[PDB]
Design a protein around this nucleic acid. Structure first.
Ligand SMILES: [Mg+2]
Ligand SMILES: [Mg+2]
Ligand SMILES: [Mg+2]
Ligand SMILES: [Mg+2]
Ligand SMILES: [Mg+2]
Ligand SMILES: [Mg+2]
Ligand SMILES: [Mg+2]
Lengths: 124, 155, 189, 252
RNA sequence: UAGAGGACAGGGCCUUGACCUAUUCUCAAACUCCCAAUAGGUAAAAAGGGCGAAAUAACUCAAUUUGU
RNA sequence: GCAGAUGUCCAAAGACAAGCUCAAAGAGAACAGAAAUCUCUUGUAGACUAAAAGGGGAAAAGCUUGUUUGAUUUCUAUUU
RNA sequence: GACUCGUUCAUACUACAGUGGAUACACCAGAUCCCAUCAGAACUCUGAAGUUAAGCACUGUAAGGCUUGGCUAGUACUGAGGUGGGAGACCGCUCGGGAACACCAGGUGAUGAGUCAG
C-alpha cells in the first residue's frame, strides 16, 4: 500500500564536448522537452541535465520509451537516444534517507532491487 | 635547532583511538573559581588556547578567569629552581583536577566524625592510619584445601 | 663484494628497514623462503624439525640463502623431492650500511632472538632423521649457536600430534594447504 | 573488497548519540550553552522550539552537567484547551505556543505582574536565547513566530527582524500571526477547485471554521492565554542454538 | 612468505593469471588496537577551611540584592 | 646523526554564517572506450585542507553559496 | 504507552531478520502565501486522505564489533643490587614492579529534567 514502487526521479542527461555553444543548444533542447531550466555539469562545463519529479517525469518516461541489462542492482534503470534517460525508482518513505532532521537508512526489504524494478516495468 | 611551539607532539596532542570528534558540550559547564586546582589536558581539536607541550598533564591553581580563558599558575622546573608560570588557556583544555576533591571528601567525613566525638566526648584519632603491619590471627584451613607445591621440571 | 660477517653479527643499531627513509637498497639474496612440496596438505606430513637459534644475532641474507640451499640439496639427495617441506621462518628486513659520516645501505640481515626458529622442515614421520641431518648441515652456515629441535607438534600447525589426531577424529579442524583452521563454535550458520 | 570489514568496525568511532539519531547540532549547542566562565552561576536559559510534524514544542531549558532542566514547557496541542482547535503547525499556532510558554515560565517564576510585554498584536526583561536546533532558519520560519510570541509575552529573546515574513514588513508578520494567510489560502481554494478544498481543510470544515472567523478565534485564544496558564540470557540462547541444530539434523 | 577456498582478462570444459574470502610466515628509529617498569606532577587544613548572618559594588543577573 | 622543509604564496586560500559531503569501489545509462557527464547503493575520511612533515578536521576546519574587510586602532597579563 | 531537551558517547555501533503502532513520533497530501531550488527531492509553508511499508521503538542472531571478566603469565619487559655466570652475545640470582595480542566466558545498556495520553 505504502510499498508501491513509484518513479522517484527521472534525469535527462546530455554530455557533449566542452561548452562551445553546442552545450547551449543542448540545454535549449532540454528546456523545450521539459519545462525545467537545465543545469550544467563541470570538468574534473561538459554536460547538461535536468531532474524531474511526478506526473511530468512519468510523461517524459512514457514518451522516452519510444532490456534485462539496463536495470541496476539497486533497481534503477536507464536508456539512451541525443539524450540519456535515467529513471531512479523508489517506494514511499524514501525521504527518511534524504531529509535534514533525523536522516536514517532505509531497510533492505524496502530498497527496490532489480527483480522488483523489472516487475514494475512489466506492469506499466 | 627546531624548537617550535608544537614539537615532540606527534603523540602528546594526538586524540586517542575512537575519541576524535571534539570536546563534548557538557565539558563547558565545569565550574571554576579563583583557587580551584586544574589539570591542563590539551584537547588538540581546539587549536585556539593550546597551551605549550610541557604543561600537558601538569596541574595548577586558577589565578584568572575570562570570557573563555583560564589563567593557571603552574610550576615549571627550570634548572636550579621551580618557577610560577601563568599559563593562559581556553576552557577546552583545562579540566578540573580530582586530587583536591579526595581531600575535600575526607574533610567532610572528618567534620562529621568530630561532631560525633563531641556528642560523647571521646579521643577519636582522625589522621589516616597508613597500611601498618597485620595483627595476629588464627586462620582455619582444612587439610583438604592446602595444595602443596614443588618447583616445576624444565620443558 | 662483502665484509667478514663478524662485522654484522650482533644486533647493535635499531632495526632499519626498506622504506621511504632508505630507498636505494639492494634486494635480499633469499627469495624462495619455503621449498620442497610447498603445496602439501596438513595431513600429509607429521614430522616437523625446527632449527632454533639460541642467540641474539643477525644472520646475513646470503648466509640464510646458503643454508636453505644446503637443506634443499641434501633432502633431494636423501629422500624424494616431494616428501618434505622446508620453510625458512625468518626474513631479512633490517638493512646494513657501509662507510667508505653515515653509511650508505649495503645488504640486508635477518635479526633473531634466543627463543625463535630459523628453519623448519615438515616431512613424513619416516624421514625425520634425514631432516634433522639436513638442518644440522645447514647450521654450519649460520653464525652462533643453533640447535636442531624435533617438535611435539603436527607440522607448522600449532597442535600436538595426539591433539591433532583427536581433532581429526571429531571433525573440528579443516585442512587448507599447510595451515589448518580450527572451528571454534562461534560464527553464524 | 567489502568496505564494512571487521577492521573497519574496530576502527569505527560512533558519533554522539543525539547526532547519530539526527536531532542535535552539538557545535551549535555548545556555543548556545557556554557563557563566560567569569559569570559563574549565570544559568543562560535557552528557548527551544521544535517543529514536529503535527505540533510545535516550546521549552525553556537551563543546562546542567547531569542533564538539561526544563523550567517551562508548552506544546501546541494544549491550544485546544484555549479555544483553538486544528492548524497546530500553523505560524499563528506557533506564535500562540511561544506566547503560552513564556506565560507559563513567568507564572513558574512568580513574576507575571511585572512582565506583560506587547499587549495585543501590532525591571529589565527576562533573557533567553533561541535554540532553533537543526531546522534551517529561512525567512518566514515557524520557530521565529514562536520566538515573536515569546517576546510579546515577557521574554527578551534577542533577534534581528530579517526572518519575519517578507523581509522588514510588519503587516505581513501581523497577518501571519492572525492566521490571515491561511484564511486567504482557504478562500482561494474555495474559489477554484472546491472538491480539493473540501479534501484539504477537512478538520477545519468539521469544526465549522470558515475563513473570516479564524482571525477572531486566534485573537480569543491569545486573550485566554494572557488571562491564565523481553531479553533472553546466555543459557536460553544456547538452548535455542541447540534446537536449531537439531532441526537442521532432522531435515538432513 | 606460502598455499587454501572462491566468481573479471587471454588461448585451445581445461590451463595461465589478477581479484575477493578465511588463513599463514616474518617485520618497523621516523607504524600503532594495546602498553609496563623507572622517571614526573598536584594534593594531604589555622595568613587557612567549614556553615552562617549583615554590610560594600559603578561588576554580574531577569532579580538593592540573582549571585560573585 | 637520519628523512625533509623555510627566505614564500593568498581580496581570498582572510572573516562570518548557511547549506552540503569527500576519495574510492561497485552496479547501471545514446555517441562514451580502461576514462566525459548523470543516477543510485556502500562509503570514519582511505579525499581535501597554499607550500615540508606531523597533529587536527564530517550538519567541518573540507566542498559550494551568500554577505563582508577583525589582514582594524590602543593597552595589558603573559607562553615559547 | 509516547514525546522534548539532555547525560555517559558502541553494553549506545553495524548487518540481516522478526514484532509493534489508541495518543504520540513518522512517512504521507498539496504549493495560494513566507520561503527554496535545475528539481516543492531537500528546505519552507499549508494540510490529515491513508500507512506501519520504511524511519523510530522493541526483540532475535552457536552474528561481526564493542565492553567487563578470567586465561595468556608472574610469560614478555623492567627499577635497585651483584669482585654473579658468560670469551662475548647475552643469561641467572637478591630486593621490587609487572604487560600485550590471541583465546575462553558473560553482557549488549544505563539515565537527569519536563511534558503528553489512559
Ligand atoms: Mg680480511
Ligand atoms: Mg649504532
Ligand atoms: Mg615482534
Ligand atoms: Mg617504537
Ligand atoms: Mg557550516
Ligand atoms: Mg513493520
Ligand atoms: Mg558476538
Amino acid at each position: 500500500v505504502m510499498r508501491e514502487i513509484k518513479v522517484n526521479k527521472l534525469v535527462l542527461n546530455i554530455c557533449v564536448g566542452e561548452s562551445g555553444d553546442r552545450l547551449t543548444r543542448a540545454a535549449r533542447v532540454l528546456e523545450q522537452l521539459t519545462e525545467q531550466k537545465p543545469i550544467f555539469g563541470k570538468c574534473r562545463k561538459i554536460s547538461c541535465f535536468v531532474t524531474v519529479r511526478g506526473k511530468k517525469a512519468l510523461e517524459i518516461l512514457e514518451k522516452g520509451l519510444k532490456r534485462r541489462k539496463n536495470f541496476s542492482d539497486t533497481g534503477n534503470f536507464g536508456f539512451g537516444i541525443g539524450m540519456d534517460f535515467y529513471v531512479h525508482l523508489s517506494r514511499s518513505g524514501y525521504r527518511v534517507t534524504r531529509r535534514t532532521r533525523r536522516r536514517s537508512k532505509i531497510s533492505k526489504t524496502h530498497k527496490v532491487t532489480k527483480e522488483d524494478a523489472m516487475k514494475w516495468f512489466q506492469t506499466k | 635547532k627546531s624548537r617550535g611551539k608544537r614539537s615532540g607532539t606527534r603523540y602528546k596532542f594526538s586524540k586517542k583511538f575512537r575519541k576524535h570528534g571534539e570536546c563534548t558540550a557538557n565539558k563547558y559547564l565545569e565550574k571554576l573559581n579563583y583557587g580551584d586546582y586544574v589539570d591542563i589536558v590539551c584537547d588538540s581539536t581546539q587549536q585556539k588556547g593550546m597551551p605549550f607541550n610541557y604543561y600537558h598533564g601538569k596541574t595548577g591553581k586558577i589565578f584568572h578567569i575570562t570570557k573563555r580563558g583560564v589563567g593557571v599558575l603552574v610550576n615549571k622546573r627550570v634548572k636550579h629552581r621551580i618557577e610560577q608560570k601563568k599559563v593562559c588557556v581556553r576552557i577546552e583544555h583545562v579540566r578540573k583536577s580530582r586530587c583536591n576533591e579526595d581531600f575535600l571528601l575526607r574533610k567532610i567525613k572528618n567534620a562529621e566524625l568530630i561532631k560525633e566525638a563531641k556528642l560523647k566526648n571521646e579521643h577519636i584519632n582522625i589522621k589516616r592510619k597508613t597500611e601498618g603491619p597485620k595483627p595476629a590471627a588464627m586462620i582455619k584451613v582444612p587439610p583438604s584445601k592446602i595444595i602443596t607445591i614443588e618447583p616445576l621440571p624444565f620443558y | 663484494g662483502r665484509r667478514p660477517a663478524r662485522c654484522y653479527r650482533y644486533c647493535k643499531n635499531k632495526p632499519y628497514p626498506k622504506s621511504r627513509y632508505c630507498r636505494g637498497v639492494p634486494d635480499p639474496k633469499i627469495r624462495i623462503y619455503d621449498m620442497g612440496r610447498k603445496k602439501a596438505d596438513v595431513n600429509e606430513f607429521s614430522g616437523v624439525v625446527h632449527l632454533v637459534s639460541y642467540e641474539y644475532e643477525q644472520i646475513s641474507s646470503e648466509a640464510l640463502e646458503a643454508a636453505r640451499i644446503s637443506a634443499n640439496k641434501y633432502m633431494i639427495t636423501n629422500c624424494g623431492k616431494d616428501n618434505f617441506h622446508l620453510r625458512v621462518r625468518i626474513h631479512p628486513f633490517h638493512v646494513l650500511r657501509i662507510n667508505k659520516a653515515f653509511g650508505k645501505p649495503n645488504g640486508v640481515v635477518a635479526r633473531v632472538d634466543i627463543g625463535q626458529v630459523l628453519l623448519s622442515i615438515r616431512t613424513k614421520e619416516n624421514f625425520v632423521s634425514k631432516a634433522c641431518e639436513a638442518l644440522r648441515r645447514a647450521k654450519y652456515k649460520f653464525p652462533g649457536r643453533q640447535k636442531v629441535f624435533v617438535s611435539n607438534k603436527w607440522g607448522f600447525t600449532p597442535f600436538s600430534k595426539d591433539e591433532y589426531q583427536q581433532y581429526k577424529k571429531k571433525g573440528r579442524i579443516i585442512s587448507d594447504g599447510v595451515s589448518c583452521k580450527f572451528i571454534r563454535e562461534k560464527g553464524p550458520l | 573488497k567489502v568496505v564494512k570489514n571487521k577492521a573497519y568496525f574496530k576502527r569505527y568511532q560512533v558519533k554522539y548519540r543525539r547526532r547519530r539519531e539526527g536531532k542535535t547540532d552539538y557545535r551549535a549547542r555548545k556555543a548556545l550553552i557556554l557563557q563566560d566562565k567569569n559569570k559563574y552561576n549565570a544559568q543562560k536559559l535557552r528557548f527551544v522550539v521544535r517543529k514536529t510534524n503535527s505540533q510545535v514544542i516550546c521549552q525553556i531549558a537551563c543546562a546542567h552537567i547531569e542533564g538539561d532542566k526544563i523550567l517551562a514547557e508548552a506544546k501546541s496541542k494544549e491550544l485546544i484547551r484555549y479555544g483553538i482547535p486544528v492548524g497546530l503547525k500553523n505560524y499563528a499556532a506557533a506564535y500562540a505556543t511561544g506566547l503560552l510558554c513564556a506565560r507559563r515560565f513567568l507564572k513558574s517564576l512568580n513574576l507575571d505582574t511585572q512582565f506583560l510585554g506587547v499587549e495585543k498584536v501590532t525591571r529589565k526583561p527576562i533573557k533567553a536565547f533561541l535554540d532553533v536546533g537543526i531546522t534551517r532558519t529561512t525567512t518566514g520560519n515557524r520557530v521565529f513566530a514562536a520566538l515573536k510570541g515569546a517576546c510579546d509575552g515577557g521574554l527578551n529573546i534577542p533577534h534581528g527582524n530579517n526572518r519575519f515574513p517578507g523581509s522588514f514588513n510588519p503587516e505581513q508578520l501581523r497577518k501571519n500571526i492572525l492566521g490571515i494567510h491561511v484564511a486567504e489560502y482557504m478562500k482561494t481554494l474555495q474559489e477554484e477547485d472546491n472538491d480539493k478544498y473540501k479534501t484539504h481543510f477537512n478538520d477545519y470544515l468539521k469544526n465549522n471554521i470558515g475563513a473570516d472567523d479564524i482571525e477572531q478565534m486566534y485573537l480569543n485564544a491569545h486573550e485566554k492565554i494572557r488571562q491564565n496558564p523481553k531479553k533472553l540470557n546466555a543459557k536460553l540462547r544456547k538452548k535455542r542454538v541447540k534446537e536449531k541444530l537439531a532441526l537442521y539434523v532432522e531435515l538432513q
